Amino acid sequence: NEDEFSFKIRRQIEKANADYKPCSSDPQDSDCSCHANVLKRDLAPYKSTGVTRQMIESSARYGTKYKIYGHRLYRDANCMFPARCEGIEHFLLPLVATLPDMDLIINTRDYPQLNAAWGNAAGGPVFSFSKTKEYRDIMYPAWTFWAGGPATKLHPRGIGRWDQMREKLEKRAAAIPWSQKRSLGFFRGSRTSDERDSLILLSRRNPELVEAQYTKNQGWKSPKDTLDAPAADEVSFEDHCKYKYLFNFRGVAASFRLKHLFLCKSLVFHVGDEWQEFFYDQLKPWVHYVPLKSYPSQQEYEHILSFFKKNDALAQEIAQRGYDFIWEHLRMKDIKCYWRKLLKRYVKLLQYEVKPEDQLIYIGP
Numbered sequence: 001n002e003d004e005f006s007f008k009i010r011r012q013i014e015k016a017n018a019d020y021k022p023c024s025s026d027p028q029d030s031d032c033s034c035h036a037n038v039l040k041r042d043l044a045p046y047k048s049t050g051v052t053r054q055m056i057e058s059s060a061r062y063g064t065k066y067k068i069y070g071h072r073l074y075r076d077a078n079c080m081f082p083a084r085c086e087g088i089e090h091f092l093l094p095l096v097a098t099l100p101d102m103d104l105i106i107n108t109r110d111y112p113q114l115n116a117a118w119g120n121a122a123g124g125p126v127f128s129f130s131k132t133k134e135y136r137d138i139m140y141p142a143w144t145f146w147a148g149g150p151a152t153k154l155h156p157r158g159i160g161r162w163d164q165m166r167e168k169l170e171k172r173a174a175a176i177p178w179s180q181k182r183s184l185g186f187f188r189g190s191r192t193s194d195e196r197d198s199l200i201l202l203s204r205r206n207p208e209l210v211e212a213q214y215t216k217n218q219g220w221k222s223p224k225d226t227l228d229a230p231a232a233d234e235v236s237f238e239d240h241c242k243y244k245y246l247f248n249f250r251g252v253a254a255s256f257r258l259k260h261l262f263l264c265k266s267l268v269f270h271v272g273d274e275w276q277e278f279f280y281d282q283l284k285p286w287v288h289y290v291p292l293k294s295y296p297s298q299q300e301y302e303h304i305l306s307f308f309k310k311n312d313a314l315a316q317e318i319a320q321r322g323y324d325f326i327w328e329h330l331r332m333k334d335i336k337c338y339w340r341k342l343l344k345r346y347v348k349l350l351q352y353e354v355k356p357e358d359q360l361i362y363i364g365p
């Protein structure tokens, strides 16, 4: 019983860290290649045929049309989520000076647009922040890296400033050494996916093992949105760092929580393997984090937390590498250059001449 489990996890770890190769030959990643595999596989379905003017106008129904013309940025007057457009635009604007013309259909909704099961209508290309193997959407660094992530009490203008968040969590990480972190699984968040229930129910059944509560979101409808319990408070990102075992679940799509959880130097438990942001591909299970299949049971949880509470040296090794990765390969520099290479390889696919369009508004610079 306990030993069978004990080994299985150990083989999986031994196997994983034996198999691991760094995302780049040197830590500085001068050529911006760490996540180059993702943009590669993402554009691929267009390599043979290219992007037609037709495909573009068709795909325009799937998001916010950006257009770079003669090194000037143009965008649909109406952006669905104004603050999200501002997050992306912080990134597009400095590149526009050195980019050729292109048309972009950028989806600022949480959920991807181009279902591969449908055909022809959903060929693309459309840019989204999060997808699964189901979707043809091209992945980009989300708006929240600069501004427009979830608005909360602690982040009234919506969570952002990754440059600032990094310095902040880094301090808090150094201040709270591993041994001083509480040996409890931690979570605080809203019921954006029922994959989160089992941890919350377990917490109510065993608070000494799991401290996990549902918060309230702006889409709250009834008591069901917190499994009939009183809405807990938002707890800050720095305050996560006092617990050893931090859980990350998908929401509508992938959650912004993940990247922040690593910089606590706590052990990140990532549930589900479906939903991605661009950098995830290089986040390797058992190396950087503990993997958990979607819809985990209360018993899965006890066994896995019990295992790591009983293998403290091993836990710490993982927390450390997980921290180092986000630290070394998710700097603002990594974000801007992914943006850069992505658009550069994308423009090459276009089989048509980008013409200006009057209904579009001038964005900058």
Ligand SMILES: O=c1ccn([C@@H]2O[C@H](COP(=O)(O)OP(=O)(O)O)[C@@H](O)[C@H]2O)c(=O)[nH]1
Pocket: 149, 150, 152, 159, 188, 189, 190, 191, 192, 215, 217, 233, 234, 235, 236, 237, 250, 251, 252, 255, 256, 257, 258, 260
């Ligand atoms: O107590 C909390 C609850 C949420 N968040 C952050 O606010 C965002 C929204 O999280 P929520 O669970 O509400 O939705 P998600 O985006 O995770 O599906 C995420 O980036 C969380 O990391 C936080 O820092 N503290």
